[PDB]
Amino acid sequence: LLPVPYTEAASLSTGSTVTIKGRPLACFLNAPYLQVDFHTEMKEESDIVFHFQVCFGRRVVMNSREYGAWKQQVESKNMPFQDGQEFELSISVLPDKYQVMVNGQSSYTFDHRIKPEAVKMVQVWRDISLTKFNVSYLKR
Amino acid sequence: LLPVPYTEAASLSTGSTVTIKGRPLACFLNAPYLQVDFHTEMKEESDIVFHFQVCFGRRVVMNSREYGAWKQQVESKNMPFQDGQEFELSISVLPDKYQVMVNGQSSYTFDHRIKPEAVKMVQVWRDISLTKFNVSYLKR
Ligand SMILES: OC[C@H]1O[C@@](CO)(O[C@H]2O[C@H](CO)[C@@H](O)[C@H](O)[C@H]2O)[C@@H](O[C@H]2O[C@H](CO)[C@@H](O)[C@H](O)[C@H]2O)[C@@H]1O
Ligand SMILES: OC[C@H]1O[C@@](CO)(O[C@H]2O[C@H](CO)[C@@H](O)[C@H](O)[C@H]2O)[C@@H](O[C@H]2O[C@H](CO)[C@@H](O)[C@H](O)[C@H]2O)[C@@H]1O
C-alpha cells in the first residue's frame, strides 16, 4: 500500500524506534535487496548516518556516508529473513548504537558514528513492498 | 505506467528486438540497479538464458543461470546511462549474440550460451520505473 521508494521526514533520539513491515518482491534465489537509509537532509544525495542493506538470502551490510563518502562497511551473514515471507523490521535507537530486530529477534547492531539527532529523513527502497512504516518515541 | 517488477511472456529468435524505456528511481550517487532477465519458463525460479544487470554509474554484469547455477560473469565498465535521465534500451537477437543498444549507441554484446528459442519470459525489475516494453520480430 505504501509506495516504494518510500521517503518520510523523521527525527530520532535515544528511545526512538523505526518499524517497517514489508515483503521481498522476488524469491531469494533471485537475490532481491532491501535498503534503509537514515539521511541528514530530505535530499537523497545527502549524508547517511545509518545505511542498512539486505541482500536477501546472502548478507547484510551497514555503513555511513559522511561528507559525500562511504566509510568502513560492516558485513553480517546473519540472515533471519525467510524466503517468500513478510518481515517486520525494528530499528531502535539506544545511547550507543542502533539495534535491529527482525521478526522479534535481535539480529544486527551498529554503533553511532554521527549522532542520531542529525537524521532528518528515512528512505526505504529496493526490491520490497511495504505495508507499514512507523517512527515512535518512548522517552526514558 | 507499467508495474515493476514487470513480467511478460515472450518468444525470441534471430531478428527479435526487446525495447525498454525507463528511468532510474534514484540518483546515481545512491547506486540504483536495473535488471533484465530472459527466462526459460514463466516462473521466476527458472533458468536465465540472458541476465543483464546495471549498477547505474558503476558497471554492468551479464551472465546465464543454467540448471539452477550461475555461470561465468562478464563485466563491463561502459556506462552510457546518464544520471537522472530516461533511457531507452534495445536488446537485439543476432545469430551469434545479443546486441544491447543504449539511447541508440551499441554498448554491450553477449554471445549465446543457450539458444534464444529457449526463452519463454522476460522480467524487468530493480530500481527503475518503466514507460514502454515491446518485443518486435523482423524476420530476415
Ligand atoms: O557509491 C556506491 C559504491 O560504493 C561502493 C564501494 O565502491 O559501496 C559503498 O556504497 C554501498 C551502497 O551503495 C554501501 O553498501 C557500501 O558499504 C559502500 O562501501 C560500491 O559497492 C560495491 O562495493 C561494496 C563494498 O564496499 C559492495 O558491498 C558492493 O557489492 C559493491 O557493488 C558501490 O557501488
Ligand atoms: O545467487 C545470487 C548470488 O550469486 C552471485 C555470486 O555469488 O552472483 C551471481 O548472481 C548475480 C545475480 O544475482 C549475477 O549478477 C552474477 O553474475 C552471478 O555470479 C552473488 O553476487 C555476488 O557475486 C557477484 C559476482 O559473481 C557480484 O556481481 C555481486 O556484487 C555479489 O553480490 C549473488 O548474490
Side-chain angles (χ1 to χ4, degrees):
Chain A
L1 340 120
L2 301 176
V4 174
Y6 183 78
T7 300
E8 184 170 308
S11 289
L12 302 180
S13 60
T14 301
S16 297
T17 302
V18 181
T19 303
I20 300 160
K21 183 151 217 213
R23 186 161 226 131
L25 293 175
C27 64
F28 281 18
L29 187 74
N30 290 352
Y33 287 78
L34 160 66
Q35 190 158 323
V36 181
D37 297 308
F38 294 179
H39 278 267
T40 58
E41 298 298 333
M42 285 304 287
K43 316 151 37 203
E44 78 187 16
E45 293 93 350
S46 65
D47 284 357
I48 296 171
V49 175
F50 181 48
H51 159 78
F52 178 83
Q53 188 192 83
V54 185
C55 185
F56 286 102
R58 197 165 67 76
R59 65 164 189 173
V60 169
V61 295
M62 302 157 297
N63 210 343
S64 55
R65 186 172 68 203
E66 310 182 22
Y67 279 93
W70 288 104
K71 298 297 178 110
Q72 181 70 263
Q73 169 174 282
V74 174
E75 205 197 305
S76 171
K77 302 286 199 323
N78 192 21
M79 192 37 66
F81 304 89
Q82 292 309 290
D83 196 354
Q85 307 306 312
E86 190 175 68
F87 56 79
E88 176 172 5
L89 184 72
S90 197
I91 302 165
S92 297
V93 188
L94 320 170
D96 57 321
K97 61 202 172 211
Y98 297 102
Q99 178 162 41
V100 182
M101 320 286 288
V102 180
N103 303 323
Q105 150 189 350
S106 181
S107 303
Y108 317 92
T109 66
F110 183 89
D111 290 349
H112 296 306
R113 298 177 182 182
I114 298 169
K115 53 181 188 197
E117 287 85 1
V119 173
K120 300 172 169 177
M121 179 262 278
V122 178
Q123 188 176 48
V124 182
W125 61 303
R126 316 254 189 208
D127 311 297
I128 78 282
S129 57
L130 271 197
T131 56
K132 183 254 190 43
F133 181 96
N134 184 248
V135 179
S136 277
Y137 182 54
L138 186 38
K139 161 165 283 192
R140 292 184 182 175
Chain B
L1 340 120
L2 301 176
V4 174
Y6 183 78
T7 300
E8 184 170 308
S11 289
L12 302 180
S13 60
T14 301
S16 297
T17 302
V18 181
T19 303
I20 300 160
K21 183 151 217 213
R23 186 161 226 131
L25 293 175
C27 64
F28 281 18
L29 187 74
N30 290 352
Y33 287 78
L34 160 66
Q35 190 158 323
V36 181
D37 297 308
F38 294 179
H39 278 267
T40 58
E41 298 298 333
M42 285 304 287
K43 316 151 37 203
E44 78 187 16
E45 293 93 350
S46 65
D47 284 357
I48 296 171
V49 175
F50 181 48
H51 159 78
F52 178 83
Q53 188 192 83
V54 185
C55 185
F56 286 102
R58 197 165 67 76
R59 65 164 189 173
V60 169
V61 295
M62 302 157 297
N63 210 343
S64 55
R65 186 172 68 203
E66 310 182 22
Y67 279 93
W70 288 104
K71 298 297 178 110
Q72 181 70 263
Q73 169 174 282
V74 174
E75 205 197 305
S76 171
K77 302 286 199 323
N78 192 21
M79 192 37 66
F81 304 89
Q82 292 309 290
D83 196 354
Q85 307 306 312
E86 190 175 68
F87 56 79
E88 176 172 5
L89 184 72
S90 197
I91 302 165
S92 297
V93 188
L94 320 170
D96 57 321
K97 61 202 172 211
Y98 297 102
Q99 178 162 41
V100 182
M101 320 286 288
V102 180
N103 303 323
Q105 150 189 350
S106 181
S107 303
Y108 317 92
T109 66
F110 183 89
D111 290 349
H112 296 306
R113 298 177 182 182
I114 298 169
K115 53 181 188 197
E117 287 85 1
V119 173
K120 300 172 169 177
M121 179 262 278
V122 178
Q123 188 176 48
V124 182
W125 61 303
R126 316 254 189 208
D127 311 297
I128 78 282
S129 57
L130 271 197
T131 56
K132 183 254 190 43
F133 181 96
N134 184 248
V135 179
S136 277
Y137 182 54
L138 186 38
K139 161 165 283 192
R140 292 184 182 175

